[PDB]
Amino acid sequence: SKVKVGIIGGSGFLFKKVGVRQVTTPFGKPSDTLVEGFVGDVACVVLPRHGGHLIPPSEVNYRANVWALKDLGCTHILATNACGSLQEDLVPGDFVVLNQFMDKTWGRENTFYGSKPDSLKGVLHMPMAEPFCERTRQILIQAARNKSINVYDKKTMDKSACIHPCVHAEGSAVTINGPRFSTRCESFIHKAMGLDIVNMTLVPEVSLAREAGLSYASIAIVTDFDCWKSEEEHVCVDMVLEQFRKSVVHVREILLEAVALIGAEDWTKTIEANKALVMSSRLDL
Amino acid sequence: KVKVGIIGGSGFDDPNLFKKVGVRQVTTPFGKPSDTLVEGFVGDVACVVLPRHGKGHLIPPSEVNYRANVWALKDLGCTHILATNACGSLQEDLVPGDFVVLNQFMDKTWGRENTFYGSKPDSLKGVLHMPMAEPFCERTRQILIQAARNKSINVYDKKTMDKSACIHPCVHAEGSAVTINGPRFSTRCESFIHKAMGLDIVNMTLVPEVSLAREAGLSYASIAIVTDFDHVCVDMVLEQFRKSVVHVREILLEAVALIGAEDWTKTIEANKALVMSSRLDLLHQGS
Amino acid sequence: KVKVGIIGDDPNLFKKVGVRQVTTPFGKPSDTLVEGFVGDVACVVLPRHGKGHLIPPSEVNYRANVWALKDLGCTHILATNACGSLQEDLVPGDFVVLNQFMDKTWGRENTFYGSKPDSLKGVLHMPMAEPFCERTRQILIQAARNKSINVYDKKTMDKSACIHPCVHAEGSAVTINGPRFSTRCESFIHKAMGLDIVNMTLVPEVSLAREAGLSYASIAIVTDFDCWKSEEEHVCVDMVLEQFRKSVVHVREILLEAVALIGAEDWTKTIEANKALVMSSRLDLL
Ligand SMILES: Nc1ncnc2[nH]cnc12
Ligand SMILES: Nc1ncnc2[nH]cnc12
């Protein structure tokens, strides 16, 4: 019944520290030390995904990061991800509480289970049709409302209500491997598929969190229009850094409010269901 | 002169298709196969059976040694490989309980060894660029389809039949699979995209098995089982999958008999000639 | 001054000085390199698949090949690639000066930088919206005009004005990992996405050339229709080689003219912009 919130911070990334934990996992070392402490009465653990941002997205040890948070007793993970927009409604400065993704990563360790010595014993086939924890998604959305940040829900709001900057209540991300950005050809193809944003760090992090029995939700920071618009609006690293810094302030407020909103509810049945889903997805029984 | 290898997928972890005459615990130049190989006969036709995931289904799709499985069967003198694959549906007319004799695929796998050849010392010498436009052995595909007819299973061919001939359960006489890496299932977003591309089913094990079989000079065909990777429905899906396994077992046993009733000398030679004609290094030297 | 590398050499046009073996921080290049001159312009020729054509596309050391040309002082790289056509107006014997691509390769070393000891220390996030050097693209096209080869621009001209064999003034490529050719299902999917050609070797070569601060342009050689047409037109090795041997003399004329055209212009601002793009993409330093 205990609740403990892990926070995985991307580009641009909270409380007074109780302890710094140098941990190891059976999958290797996490990206950095883990800082443990409290937000109000809620226990919380913070972990930077890139550790002085020297580790590219394809080389982050997502297994060790998620497992380390599980081993410190986290029940939830809140994650941030920098991204580029593929659609006109999503402009730099907006946020997206994602609910879908398309995976184009490769060469990353994306599961804890297998038949090799470097993995846990078993064959795990996890359902991923709706790959995030829906309860935690709505917490992020309500947190933005409580902090007087606009929310745009395309299902129930006219397009004229999309007042920027705003938090988009839904969205799909294509995760590319990096480190290069997309070509205009690739951006047009992803947009034609109906995708909303492009990023590099969401997958396999989201999949491993569900394998570990954790509730996971992501808030993406729109820093650019990818490269499907005008040449002045094409992505570079400086464009990504120049927008993260301005938006980090507001995503901090959202994260800290979401931690408090998580602590204000009972999660006994959701945590139980997270664990049961893993056990029922074991094909080796 | 024929010998039929069988690679059993989910539902065939311990097949027992015939009385075991002998066993082969072997390795290959590309590592260990998934399990020991079981030898026997269907009538007078030699047969060898190998569970793709191992006896206890301990090996996930991404970690299956497709190269060792295909090579071990080639080493034993197999001329054909029949494989089973459990799949999910992406289209309205493919429903749980149906079967598909695949003729096409779209590859979204990565990180698997998918060729016997290359420039590394542990690969076979040479560069092989195989044609894959119609990646299966068409003659063996038609034997699987005829075996279903002979076992009283409906066959639906959307090229010549209207949709009212789609009577379930049925063998779809053609179809395309997207092969994904796994182990996780697809998101709704990914499934929507694969459906929009026109793909019929989704699976995790077809590729690179089919590609390696053609590299090895073997006639390969796959029969896929459509199941449901989803009030209560799990018990009905499992009973339905059990019934599908019994049907596929009947199809496999009849197909081995049908293969054995014909001569394959020309087709086997054509399979070997196709490998040689795809050796880029040799054809560059030829000119 | 400039110096042109050619990744993919007659007597009266290429004055061969010598053959060179080099090493790089990322291993050995595919083969030794031929150093020479086209007029007064220094030129280096490097075959992608090595001696005996024993190296398949997925195992080519693109990092070593590009870095070796960088270390020898090249300012430009011109590349040729055989390819299959996905569209009716691109026919065997044509050429394509690509301007776009979609990447379906995996497991290749595609960046010089990273956190492993096998790569240079750092994190490079390169923009790739328009991944080629446009000035060098337009030289390849103008080289074709100078050699009396037809040029077809589908933005300006009409399908009824396409004269073969022609250099297509733009186009997009899907790069697949190989070694196998595509299925018919994959071919039609790529065609439906709007792609023009399919190949195996463009990526990561084009990406690493930009990482190295070099101007890179590719002219593809259409050898086949992949496998979206009739059975006698489905791709195979013999078909690819038969057409390649007949088109290679035209593409040799283009590349030799392009090298002389590059030498006739100043590239000071372009080269400086190439290097400034690399440094501004170094996340670890910013
Ligand atoms: N366009 C983009 N593509 C990938 N990752 C990004 N991060 C920020 N913008 C991005
Ligand atoms: N159809 C094709 N596909 C991939 N690479 C090729 N190279 C030449 N033709 C090709």
Numbering used by the authors:
A (entry chain B): 2 to 14, 19 to 56, 58 to 291
B (entry chain C): 3 to 232, 240 to 296
C (entry chain A): 3 to 10, 15 to 292
Copy out sentences from the published article reporting this entry, exactly as the authors wrote them.
Because the S. mansoni genome does not codify an adenosine phosphorylase, one alternative to fulfilling this activity is 5´-deoxy-5´-methylthioadenosine phosphorylase (E.C. 2.4.2.28) (MTAP). Furthermore, a comparison of the KM levels reveals that S. mansoni MTAP can use adenosine with the same efficiency as MTA, which is one fundamental difference between S. mansoni and its host and reveals a potential target for schistosomiasis drug development.
This residue is situated in the last helix (H8) from the other subunit and potentially interacts with the O5' adenosine ribose (as seen in SmMTAP tubercidin complex) and S12. In HsMTAP, the side chain of L279 points towards the hydrophobic MTR binding site. These mutants showed an increase in KM of 4.4X and 4.1X, respectively.
